[PDB]
């Protein structure tokens, strides 16, 4: 019911007319399950079940936007500390409103 397809000698021919099923690469293919396939389809196409609810907005804001806000605040604090550490004047960052034009330290200058 089966036969060896591969030939190391190089005399390989595919027996498409052979009564016996070749032991080709498809021999070892996984059989698969109907419900697992539908679970895969459901999980990939989870945007179909997306619904805007106040709970969904709450979750998205509190975790994603919350983490962005926390990271931005921490980065701003670190920049302020580094400016105090280095001796630089308060730097004009994009959303900080500063009446100083200091952006890039002059290498030649001693701070």
């Amino acid at each position: 019911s089966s036969r060896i397809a591969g030939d190391t000698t190089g005399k390989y021919t595919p027996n498409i007319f052979s009564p016996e099923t070749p032991m080709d690469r498809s021999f070892s293919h996984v059989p698969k399950n109907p419900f697992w396939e539908a679970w895969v389809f459901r999980r990939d196409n989870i945007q179909r079940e997306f619904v805007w609810t106040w709970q969904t907005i709450f979750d998205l804001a509190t975790f994603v936007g919350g983490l962005y806000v926390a990271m931005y605040a921490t980065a701003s604090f670190c920049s302020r500390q580094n400016d105090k550490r280095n001796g630089y004047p308060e730097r004009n960052y994009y959303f900080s409103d500063s009446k100083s034009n200091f952006v890039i330290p002059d290498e030649r200058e001693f701070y």
């Binding site: 990271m71 921490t74 980065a75 959303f95 890039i104």
Partner: protein, 438 residues
């Protein structure tokens, strides 16, 4: 340099004159010859010439090509990984598409003109639209995603290049120009934001990797993500440093958010290629942030970590492609007992997964140490944030390994002689870089 460019132009040229039955053999020989030409370019690149090792121009500002530290590493990496892509791909159509893509990408790395960089890099726009949207195994949605994302980001970059060419009169890197404008800085930045997958512009990469062929995935992960750092070191940092220092808190916000949310999204994956593709996105953020510090440590660490990624992620993608050939499945839940059924494949899979988790005997360790040191030079908290959330990667990698490792299976799915030949160079390069020959 000239030999490398000539060979890069020769590879697509040869396909027109080959017999169409000798195409695979000729393409493999051409790829190895290009690798040797890249080694020659490294030989003729003297470290005494500190700014640029080599510069060649062929009659115009657009035809100005040159190699620096970043360019030389990335070009050697692409020339190293291309032959593996060549052997993995069958058919004159596929060979033609992949050769044209590689020629365009490799010409982009050494280009010193922003407009020529744009012209060469986006020439491979339809080729991926056709490649990822191939008849039976491709998805049109992913091709649309990648094509549209690239088009919008590259058009913004092009507008910034036009403004620079109008104001300065030149857009070549070798001519020193500085600008403080934020619109032009954002125009150059948006390309980097999209090409290096950074949240929320990372959605194109997953769909592309899953529905691209194994050679296509290998090239995409290996060098097309690294094109962002060539653009950053060559075309953004020299001119747009004032804007990166002005926006550094925002840059850190976006980078660390990309790291964290990409790590969390990786946990929800059931497809092996998607797991590797999301690991790539989390890995890109450290590179982008380390370069953005504009320090000696950051640039070197970013280019090193790019080399480490371009040696580790192609191996994982290649192993997954081999397993999919053997099993016709990519779902982790279908795949069990791989340790007993495929000991040789399992050994290399575990080795590369350890590499992706940045264990000491792997290049990712050295690269990560340098990048974290640069972040620590900026601030302690910056490094601490990245170091902690690295544990999320361990969770999903360990869960995947545990799911694959054991169980009951009735199929021997182990790699053949061709497959082992395919990954041997990557394993050797990984070891050699891991012991410190970065």
């Amino acid at each position: 340099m000239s030999l490398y460019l000539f060979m890069l132009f020769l590879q697509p040229l040869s396909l027109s004159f080959v017999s169409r039955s000798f195409s695979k053999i000729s393409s493999l020989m051409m790829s190895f010859a290009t690798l040797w030409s890249a080694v020659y370019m490294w030989f003729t690149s003297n470290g005494a010439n500190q700014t640029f090792y080599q510069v060649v121009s062929w009659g115009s500002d657009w035809s100005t090509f040159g190699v620096c530290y970043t360019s030389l590493y990335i070009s050697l990496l692409c020339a190293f990984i291309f032959p593996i892509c060549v052997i993995l791909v069958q058919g004159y159509r596929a060979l033609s598409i992949l050769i044209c893509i590689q020629t365009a990408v490799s010409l982009s790395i050494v280009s010193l003109h922003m407009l020529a960089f744009y012209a060469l890099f986006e020439s491979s726009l339809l080729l991926f639209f056709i490649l990822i949207g191939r008849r039976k195994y491709g998805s049109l949605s992913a091709a649309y995603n990648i094509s549209i994302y690239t088009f919008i980001s590259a058009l913004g970059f092009l507008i910034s290049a036009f403004w620079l060419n109008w104001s300065f009169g030149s857009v070549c890197a070798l001519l020193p120009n500085e600008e403080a404008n934020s619109f032009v800085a954002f125009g150059i930045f948006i390309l980097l934001w999209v090409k290096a997958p950074l949240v929320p512009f990372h959605l194109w990469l997953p769909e592309a990797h899953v529905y691209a062929p194994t050679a296509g995935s290998v090239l995409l992960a290996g060098v097309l993500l690294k094109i962002s750092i060539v653009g950053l070191h060559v075309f953004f940092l020299p001119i747009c440093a004032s804007s990166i220092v002005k926006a550094f808190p925002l840059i850190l916000s976006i980078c660390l958010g990309s790291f964290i949310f990409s790590s969390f999204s990786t946990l929800k994956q059931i497809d092996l290629k998607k797991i590797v593709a999301y690991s790539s996105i989390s890995h890109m953020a450290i590179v982008f942030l380390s370069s953005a510090t504009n320090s000696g440590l950051g640039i070197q660490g970013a280019v090193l970590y790019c080399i480490a990624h371009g040696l580790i992620s192609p191996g994982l993608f290649l192993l997954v492609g081999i397993l999919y050939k053997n099993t016709n499945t990519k779902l982790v839940f279908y795949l069990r007992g791989l340790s007993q059924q495929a000991p040789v494949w399992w050994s290399v899979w575990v080795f590369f997964m350890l590499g992706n988790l940045a264990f000491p005997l792997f290049p990712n360790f050295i690269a990560e140490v340098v990048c974290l040191s640069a972040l620590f030079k900026n601030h302690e908290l910056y490094a601490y944030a990245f170091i902690f959330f690295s544990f999320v990667g361990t969770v999903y990698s360990s869960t995947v390994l545990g799911r694959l490792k054991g169980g009951v299976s009735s199929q021997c799915v182990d790699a053949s002689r061709l497959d082992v030949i395919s990954w041997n160079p990557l394993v050797l390069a990984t070891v050699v870089t891991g012991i410190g020959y970065m």
